[PDB]
Every structure is written in C-alpha cells, then in structure tokens.
C-alpha cells in the first residue's frame, strides 16, 4: 500500500526544520541529516525476506548500483532514477542522477543539503550491502531541470580491491 506525498513532504520538512535549529554549521547539518538517512538505508536490505536474491552472495559493483538506481527509486521516491554514470577520472567514484527527488522538492533552488538525506539513504544501503560508499549529493548538472541533482557515490578501496580480484 501507499500514503500521501503531502504527509511525507510534511514530515520531512519538519524533520529538516527541526534539524536546522540544533546544528550551527551547515556541515554538521549535512552529515547529521545523512546519518538520519543512513539508518533508513541500512533498513531496506534488512526488509529482505529483478529477482536478484543477491543475499550476501557476492555480486559485482555495477549490478548493485544499476539495480539501485532503477529499482529503488521507483520503490522509494516512485520514479526510476535518471542516469547511472561510472566516473571517468577515479576508479572508485561513481554517479547516480535524479531529475526531481520525489523528496527534496518543495525546498527552493540553492539548498543542496536537504538533498543529502536522500543521498544518505544510498550510503546506508551500500554500507550494509557490504560495500562502503560515500554519497555526497550535488545540484548541478541542471540542464533543463531546476533541481536535477547528482549524488557522488565515492567508494572505499576495499570494494575496489575485492572487485579487482574477481572481475
């Protein structure tokens, strides 16, 4: 079943509103909201009880990432992510593109940090996945979309090494 984007939009804004009052520096806010997202992220793999029963049994990096952008967003935000870009400058860094985060939308143009909570969900998922990430969102590229933002999913060498060994 489902619920109203309005309530979620509402709960979230209050969540952010509250978060804004505690934290003095933008940095603590970004990292803290992300942690909030992380706990949600760890939880998704946990729910486990297209038929990728990846169950701790090893699967390459791209398989999870490609599953994650197409499968999860529609499951979460309710819209297949936009693009999944394997960087072309550093071997651990990847990129996942979103047009309009079904979440961080009502929030006005500049403020990137609110965006991080959605990105944190990605981090928690991968960390539990057994492949630590480092999702840091960004509101640019903005081709024909005021808010299209891309989350920077930088990985830890351990995933880099496990993968290098079994291509």
């Amino acid at each position: 079943q489902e619920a109203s984007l309005s309530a979620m939009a509402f709960l979230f804004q209050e969540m952010i509103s509250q978060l804004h009052r505690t934290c003095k520096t933008a940095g603590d806010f970004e990292t803290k909201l992300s942690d909030y997202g992380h706990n949600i992220g760890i939880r998704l793999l946990e729910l486990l009880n297209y038929i990728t029963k990846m169950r701790r049994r090893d699967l390459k990096i791209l398989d999870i990432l490609q599953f994650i952008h197409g499968t999860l967003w529609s499951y979460l935000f309710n819209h297949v992510s936009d693009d999944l870009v394997k960087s072309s400058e550093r071997d651990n860094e990847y990129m996942i593109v979103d047009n309009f985060p079904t979440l961080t939308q009502f929030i006005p143009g500049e403020n990137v940090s609110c965006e991080y909570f959605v990105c944190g969900i990605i981090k928690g998922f991968l960390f539990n996945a057994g492949f630590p990430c480092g999702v840091t969102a960004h509101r640019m590229p903005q081709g024909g979309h005021s808010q299209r933002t891309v989350y920077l999913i930088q990985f830890d060498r351990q995933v880099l090494d496990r993968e290098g060994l079994r291509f």
């Binding site: 309005s6 979230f12 804004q13 509103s17 804004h20 929030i107 006005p108 143009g109 609110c114």
Partner: protein, 159 residues
C-alpha cells in the same frame, strides 16, 4: 487578463506581490504593503456596513487540474470584488483567513467565478509550496523561487 496577484497576510499584511506582465511599475514596495493593509481594513469595513439583509462551479482552467467539482466558498460577507474602468480586483480569502487577490487589467458575473477558481488554485499552490518549505516562517513575506514559477505559468495559461 491578470496583471497583479497578491496574498494578504492571514493578518492583513502583504506577504506576496507580483505585478508582472506589464513591467511598468508605478508602486513602491512600501506602498504596496499599505495597500494590502487597506484592502484588509476595507475588506473588514464592508462586513459591518452590510445591509439590513438579515455554491461555485468550475470552468476547468487556470492552467486534469487540482480540483474538478463545484467547490465551496467561505467569505459570504467580505469585499469579494472591487471593479473599475481599469480593472477588477477579486479578493479571495481562505477559511484560514488568507486573502489572495488577483488584479485583472480587463474590466467587467462569471468574471468573479474565474478568479474564485484561479485564486483557489493559487491558494492550493501556496499550500504545497509555502507550507512545505522548511525555510518558511508563517505570516512572513514569501521569498520563494518555486512559487513564482507556478504562479507565472498559471497566469499565462489564464491569459
């Protein structure tokens, strides 16, 4: 044919004003505030001076839409309209007390209906945009980047 649309603070202070199409401003920020305020008071005065006199439809336009059924109005005693030779102001206030007003360069009963529909649409807009903005402190001006996009697009469709 709208030229100016403002939302008057649930308390009678101008929070939102956007005179756009013309782009030939004759009024200063300060005065517009006063005006919204005056509208608030006069809106108030008409109610008392009511006579010893002891529902809406829907044209499907302003931009499927937000609401397609005959909806309910609430202010059955306040300044619902001021019309002249140069325009026709439509004061659409919400049960929540909010008063959204649309100024129309065109002049003039169905004209009132259009604003009732268009403004209610804008009130709705205010609710998703204004209300969900974690960075908005109530009864305070609206410095929203997003609200402008939806109203401006809404003003062009009706135009």
């Amino acid at each position: 044919a709208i030229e100016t649309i403002l939302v008057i603070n649930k308390s009678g202070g101008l929070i939102y004003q956007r005179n756009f199409t013309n782009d030939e401003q004759k009024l200063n920020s300060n005065e517009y505030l006063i005006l919204a305020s005056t509208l608030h008071g006069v809106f108030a005065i008409a109610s008392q001076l009511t006579p010893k006199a002891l529902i809406p439809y829907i044209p499907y336009v302003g931009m499927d839409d937000f609401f397609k059924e005959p909806f309910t109005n609430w202010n059955k005693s306040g300044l619902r309209q001021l019309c002249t030779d140069q325009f026709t102001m439509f004061i659409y206030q919400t049960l929540t007390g909010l008063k959204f007003v649309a100024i129309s360069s065109s002049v003039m009963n169905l004209a009132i209906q259009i604003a009732d529909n268009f403004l209610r649409k804008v009130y709705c807009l205010y609710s998703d945009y204004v209300m969900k903005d974690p960075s908005y402190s109530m009864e305070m001006p609206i410095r929203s980047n997003l609200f402008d996009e939806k109203v401006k697009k809404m003003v062009e469709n009706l135009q």
